[PDB]
């Protein structure tokens, strides 16, 4: 109701409705001359800049205009405050979304039921930081007086995601760090794979769980320590080992972990925006505390970039209302964000659960349903694999794909002087530049009859080599992938996700689908243990059930 | 015209527009008490079994009789024979469409032009299995007189995914094997991270590109080759460290690799159908040609299961139809595949090749353009992580998403008497069993109820609680991921994408969209030497080549 019931939401309807033809790329790009100059934002971080160029959409001036209009009405700048200022925006369990809280640099107090919450904050970032120095130095000893080699993360989903992704990304800042391992999945597999190659003596294991009650977590936590004390057989040596990243204390402490070896965050903190608590000792572990510092810095600049900025021209503003375009008025049922950068092959997947865990919801803050479409799906894989991959059908398949490009301009890896990187620009400009323009029959048809074929020959293959192009995409390129740039970049991502759940009227910040899951399987897990049938099901669920026994002794 | 124009096609229409609201899968499972029994293939190689549940799919008998009648009257049968009988299929290319061949165990002769394909099919196989033998045991050795410890494979696309996904899922079979690495992007850092690992001595590179012409899979040979060439200086070492897996000798040649060190295949092997063909080296070399063969024959096996059995009890086409109804019917954009198994991470990436690459097209055999939907986007990560992560939107956004769950019931680690894998077990089982049942308001209210809370507090939140449910699914259980089951499995997708294209009309065989991103950025190339800014193009794509340059600098 909220949302199509909007003077603004009601106006775009019309306008699209009635000018859907007159949005032509092509054209539009004769048109406006400087149609880039209107359509892109230059944002300088004084460690950098990042382009946002958002020319190739279907969009134009009044469409944007009307777009803005729009985020006004419903709240945005507003609702932005009520983040910021510690309200419990989350409304159905009743929390503050302060993910913002934990990149502070500024600290300024930011207050929950009256207290100031970045106290609390600064001390566990301390304790990382002489948690770090020490291990990193060596002055940290394992039991058999050993420093510590190798880092083994375990945790799933929130506590998983964003530690993976960021050290894969900040490789190059890791030569000094200890190697990290992420063990998530229940399947034995993952954690089987893993130690058959550690060497106790110098290993150590962090379990991460906000609720330290997960079930595959905790389970891949115990494997780990009845491993550990095969060798190590000393109970009081798990204290050298063992380190957890939870808000329950008890549980901590009923699992034997030291409590001075407990680095905690708070409930206000969701699992899908932890990697910039105590979530991410893994990373600064791995790649030092003061580029951990520096990822806290980017993001704490787009934090206040998108605070103060006008909506015109703010980054995560503009790239949730060209979603909502592509969503609520073209039907766009994904998003793909296609990084042109391997250190990045995570990236994607990372938003898979920020965008789609956060957004994919169909109650209103009213508690009513939604009557119109809600958070995409979204996918991708590094490029230019992706071009080799999947590409033929974003060009010539029958769907709409809006896209993101994303690359740095300056490679870590400037090998022989730097071609490399050259020919993944090259290839990172033609392909939006194609997915724009496109080939009509008579482009094609010369290029036939250039390559002297001869018309009855190239009559029946002309229509599968035109291409219609009119697709849309963004480019977002950025002067070098460090910590501080990825803080921003993900930052403004984390935004982006924010405005749209405004707009929509929904609770970006709970996941009872997830939430659910948790519980699901409890009954089911029992009723495995016999060979004898069972009953209590769907015919399916039954079926299935005594396939896997009859089976497991095959 | 074709899909459209179909007498069965458009009986199906108004089926469907007119029984929709019948289609409520709780109701169904009470409709009929042996659904399961009626909506399940059982098939046993003999070297184990594949159950293929489709019963929760919303889908009824009369539906299924009528999709069975659709494939029949668009040629599915003789479609199917022409491709087995190496007529060219490939009708744009002119090809033969025959990775069929290339598994073909029994050898029966498979003509092309008249002349049997498979004395060359088995002459490079012979040629595998020694070379394999030899690096294996370490007679094969090195300039320096060493063994090899690594093999590097090059390639990009069809060249790439295969053997990586086949590699990682094959993992256990591959003690006794050399390591792997895969490089395939032309992003420097690709090629920059693996060899500063490697020692030039013990290390082999294997260049595996169709045609020996891909910008990025030839520009990483060299790269490769130049950094070992400052070690070995010895020009004739390199026929000891490099070989080919290609079709244009010539070009093998022209690059410096002895022709005894090509291995060969035909242009009727597509590349993303090739990993059956010498350009599986990597997947023999790692985990022994042995399993090589199995992984062969269990494609062999089903192969003969798609060619000899009745439609209506053929697992591809099974598999095709309920799709074709989910995206010409329903209207679903998307398809998930959704692996609860670490081993086979890479699963769903491969297919996304594999369906999108083939079926992302838009053009008829008649020339015509489609007036309907094609190939899908296809999506997914294992779970359980994937539960923990993008399940909220499964669940509970506003988008239908049919899913396939695969899962051994043997994993290949019983870690602590099996307990991982009877929970992976019991959450593959209840996702499904949620997705279909779901939660009325009623249930959840009671459990509310239950929880001791109380009406005025749980009014708001009660809705926020409530699951629709009726969301689709197939289940696809096997007894043990083993090199013939995954070779079983592999084949089934590849034939399931071949009936679809069959009843689209379109050509699965070819990629004119990524024949074109092939050369596409030709142009671009030289333009970014220079310092000086570029004017011939779109404002954006100058905007954005300028912004570069200025920026390299920085
Ligand atoms: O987003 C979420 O809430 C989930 O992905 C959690 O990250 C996951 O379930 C782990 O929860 P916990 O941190 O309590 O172990
Ligand atoms: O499917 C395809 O055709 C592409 O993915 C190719 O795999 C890729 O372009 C590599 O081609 P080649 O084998 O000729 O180097």
């Not at 190739?56 to 945005?76: F, H, I, P, W, Y």
Request: neutral net charge; glycine residues 8%; charged residues 20%.
């Amino acid at each position: 109701a909220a949302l199509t019931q909007n003077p603004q939401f009601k106006k775009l309807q019309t306008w699209y409705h009635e000018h859907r033809s007159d949005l032509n790329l092509r054209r539009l790009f004769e048109g406006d001359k400087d149609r880039f100059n209107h359509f892109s934002l230059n944002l300088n971080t004084n460690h950098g800049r990042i382009l946002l160029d958002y020319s190739k959409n279907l969009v134009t001036e009044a469409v944007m205009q009307m777009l803005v209009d729009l985020a006004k009405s419903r709240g945005v700048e507003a609702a932005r405050e009520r983040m910021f200022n510690g309200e419990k925006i989350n409304f159905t369990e009743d929390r503050a979304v302060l993910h913002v809280a934990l990149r502070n640099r500024s600290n300024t107090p930011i207050l929950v039921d009256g207290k100031d919450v970045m106290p609390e904050v600064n001390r566990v970032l301390e304790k990382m930081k002489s948690f770090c120095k020490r291990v990193r130095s060596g002055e940290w000893k394992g039991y058999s007086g050993k420093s510590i080699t190798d880092v083994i993360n375990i945790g799933i989903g929130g506590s998983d995601l964003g530690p993976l992704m960021v050290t894969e990304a900040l490789k190059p800042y890791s030569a000094e760090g200890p190697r990290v391992w992420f063990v998530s999945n229940i399947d034995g597999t993952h954690i089987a794979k893993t130690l058959a190659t550690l060497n106790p003596e110098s290993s150590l294991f962090i379990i991460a769980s906000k609720t330290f009650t997960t079930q595959e977590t905790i389970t891949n936590a115990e494997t780990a320590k009845e491993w550990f004390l095969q060798s190590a057989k000393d109970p009081s040596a798990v204290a050298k080992h063992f380190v957890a990243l939870s808000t329950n204390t008890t549980k901590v402490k009923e699992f034997g972990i030291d409590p001075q070896n407990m680095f905690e965050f708070w409930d206000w903190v969701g699992g899908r925006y932890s990697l910039w608590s105590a979530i991410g000792l893994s990373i600064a572990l791995h790649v030092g505390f003061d580029n951990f510092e520096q990822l806290l810095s980017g993001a704490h600049w787009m934090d206040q970039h998108f605070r103060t900025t006008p909506l015109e021209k703010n980054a995560p503003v503009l790239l949730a209302l060209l979603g909502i375009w592509y969503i609520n008025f073209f039907g766009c049922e994904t998003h793909a964000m296609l990084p042109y950068d391997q250190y990045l092959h995570r990236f994607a997947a990372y938003f898979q659960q920020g965008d789609m865990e956060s957004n994919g919801k169909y109650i209103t803050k009213s508690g009513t349903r939604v009557d119109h479409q809600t958070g995409p799906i979204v996918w991708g894989e590094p490029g230019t694999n992706g071009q080799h991959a999947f590409y033929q059908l974003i060009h010539q398949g029958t769907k709409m794909i809006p896209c993101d490009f994303l690359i740095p301009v300056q490679t870590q890896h400037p090998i022989r002087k730097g071609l490399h990187h050259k020919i993944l620009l090259a290839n990172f400009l033609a392909q939006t530049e194609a997915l724009m323009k496109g080939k009509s029959t008579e482009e094609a048809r010369k290029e036939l009859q250039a390559a002297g074929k001869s018309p009855e020959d190239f009559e029946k293959l002309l229509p599968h080599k035109v291409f219609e192009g009119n697709r849309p995409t963004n480019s977002i390129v950025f002067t070098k992938l460090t910590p501080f740039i990825l803080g921003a970049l993900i930052a403004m991502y984390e935004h982006k996700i924010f405005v749209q759940g405004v707009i929509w009227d929904i609770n970006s910040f709970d996941q009872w689908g997830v939430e659910l899951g948790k519980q699901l399987a409890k009954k089911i897990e029992p009723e495995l243990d016999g060979s004898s049938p069972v009953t209590s099901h769907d015919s399916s669920t039954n079926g299935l059930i005594n396939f896997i026994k009859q089976e497991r002794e095959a």
